[PDB]
Write a protein that binds this ligand. Structure first.
Ligand SMILES: Nc1ccn([C@@H]2O[C@H](COP(=O)(O)O)[C@@H](O)[C@H]2O)c(=O)n1
Ligand SMILES: Nc1ccn([C@@H]2O[C@H](COP(=O)(O)O)[C@@H](O)[C@H]2O)c(=O)n1
Lengths: 353, 353
């Protein structure tokens, strides 16, 4: 059912001709495109964009994103003739590779100036070989920068991690005093209601906004909150002690309403959901121990004093009271504007000539 | 953190030389490996095995499967030199490509006799070009065989879909009368308990074994069952009317214990979990209407009279009643032996000379 686009990877479309002189951006898949999007948004204002991708999963997604590019084509197969026909048709001014995508024939056989963004060093031979073929490399940490320097890469800088850029959107305002728990799993729901109950003994006017990972469980979450003794309501309606959200697509807009956020996927062995969203609004986030799928992000937030790992119900209780009595300052957003700015300026300067 | 093995894909390992004359099996990733495992098991006994894979995700998994191969190497990069260095070093006797993996430099530049297994026709140009470069093609349906015939492929047969091969394991035994509900999600538990309750009015000895998609939900599932008025217990202990399973890894062993299986991910919009497993015990399986991720399997089971879709609680009751009152003969297992035998013999035939 998926389009693999083999013929096109092997023998790129004659129609790339119409995209001559574009800025070439390569985003392996959906993750890379989303990581890069706050940069593409700005470059799109100053360049025609030729957008390529490697994963066949990304084609459909990327079709919905035609506002952010002029041409769309799968990465050419990694053979000198396929890579060279692509280049020869499209006459690109530069190629920005998001994250890594060490394709040897791509890198070795194209003449186009090449830029690497958001890279980390792994210390492997292939890095020793390909790193130097980039005209500009922008890395996540100064540590990674040192390693590539010892590879004889000229023009390697550090701008921080692109994945820490805030994409806040509009934000919702509600009268009241709220904790927001987002992306909560069935196995997590008990610990959070037992803690909130413990909390409410002290903060009587405090309302919990409970947003399940899967909205098909809202009714079961509500009933659970009844059995624990809470007044409950479904969002719009703020009358409950526990307000349930049964609509997808609202959670990130909803965070700014809380003094504290809790992000699920974390008290059960899921590996964690998006810890960044609440902190972008200057609000601290608590999560359980299972953050192995968002590790870089978890470590980032701890360094920033914005993220707090709790092991159980007692610790969650403890941590909530601490944060309710002393308002924690969070400067994630400003770090975000700094990461964005660092990337944009290096890229604009490089592309200037 | 994953190894992409770029350098090896570009310049395959000298030590492939110690694998001279092996049967080369290519499994893109985990899915393909598992699909082919029942043929590999048998071919392993007559041949040295050189196993390649494309996804970096597959490496770790396949390292645990060293019983099934002699050499393990990532698929060479798709350039004539990388493909040929691989071939030259390893001197394979044949290459069996599982499923599709239409890699053109792979297909065009190697001399090794090539076999394609479990293929289907998509009717596309790359298929017209590459399909004839295979010395033997074994497809899912006679329809697919047809299409490739008109592409001038010689040696094209239909053996069925390898994904319908049963891999049953041991099979647990319990005193009692059971329905087994497997990989049930939170948003599905209510309709299953409601239907089972309506069923228990007539069949008072029936016990329901409830196996959540996720372990951590067992306690919430148990409480839910109590709210419905059932005695409950946790597995080992068969005393409840509803018996929870809070350990992973036994669902597939448990199925034969029941007269009917219900498989979840199908009543909520998940797209379905493994419908095949119970039918391999000769036991009919019921599922809800969301089977879009498991659609070929769904259609197969319907054709076989082994799988029944139900829209809601009322239909689940009706269908459970039908199957409880009149025992349904299921011949999936027998079909499975036929698919496995058709593939195995064609392959052994072609490999003999
Ligand atoms: N019930 C839910 C659950 C998640 N979400 C959102 O969907 C996205 C989920 O992404 P993550 O997997 O990165 O956590 C986030 O934007 C989160 O805010 C939502 O809007 N409603
Ligand atoms: N509680 C659970 C849930 C699933 N399982 C198993 O894990 C595998 C899940 O695969 P599927 O996604 O295809 O359903 C199946 O073999 C199923 O038997 C289990 O053993 N215990």
């Amino acid at each position: 059912h998926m389009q693999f686009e083999v013929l096109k990877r092997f023998f790129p479309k004659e129609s790339l001709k119409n995209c001559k002189g574009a800025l070439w951006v390569h985003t392996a898949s959906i993750g890379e495109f989303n990581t890069f999007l706050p940069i593409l948004k700005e470059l799109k204002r100053e360049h025609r964009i030729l957008l390529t991708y490697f994963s066949p999963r990304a084609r459909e997604y990327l079709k919905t994103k035609s506002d952010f590019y002029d041409c769309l084509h799968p990465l050419p197969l990694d053979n000198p003739f396929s890579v060279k026909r692509f280049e020869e048709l499209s006459k690109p001014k530069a190629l920005i590779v998001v994250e890594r995508e060490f394709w040897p024939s791509l890198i070795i056989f194209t003449k186009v100036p090449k830029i690497l963004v958001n890279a980390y060093a792994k210390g492997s031979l292939i890095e020793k070989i390909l790193s130097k073929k980039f005209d500009l490399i922008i890395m996540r940490t100064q540590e990674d920068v040192e390693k590539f320097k010892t590879f004889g890469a000229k023009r390697v800088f550090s701008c921080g991690n692109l994945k820490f850029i805030c994409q806040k959107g509009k934000g919702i305002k509600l009268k009241g005093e709220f904790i927001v728990a987002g992306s909560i799993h069935t196995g997590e729901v008990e610990i959070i209601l037992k803690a909130f109950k413990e909390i409410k003994k002290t903060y009587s006017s405090l309302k919990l906004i409970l947003v399940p990972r899967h909205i098909e469980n809202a009714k079961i979450f509500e009933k659970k909150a009844r059995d624990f003794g809470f007044k409950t309501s479904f969002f719009e309606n703020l009358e409950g002690d526990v307000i349930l959200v049964d609509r997808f697509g609202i959670l990130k807009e909803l965070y700014p309403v809380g003094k504290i956020a809790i992000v699920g996927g974390t008290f059960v062995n899921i590996g964690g959901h998006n810890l960044l969203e609440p902190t972008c609004w200057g609000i601290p986030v608590i999560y359980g121990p299972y953050t192995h799928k968002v590790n870089d992000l978890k470590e980032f937030l701890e360094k920033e004093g914005a993220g707090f790992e709790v092991k159980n119900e007692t610790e969650l209780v403890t941590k909530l009271t601490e944060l309710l009595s002393v308002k924690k300052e969070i400067k994630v957003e400003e770090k975000s504007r700094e990461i964005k700015g660092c990337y944009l300026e290096k890229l604009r300067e490089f592309l200037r000539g």
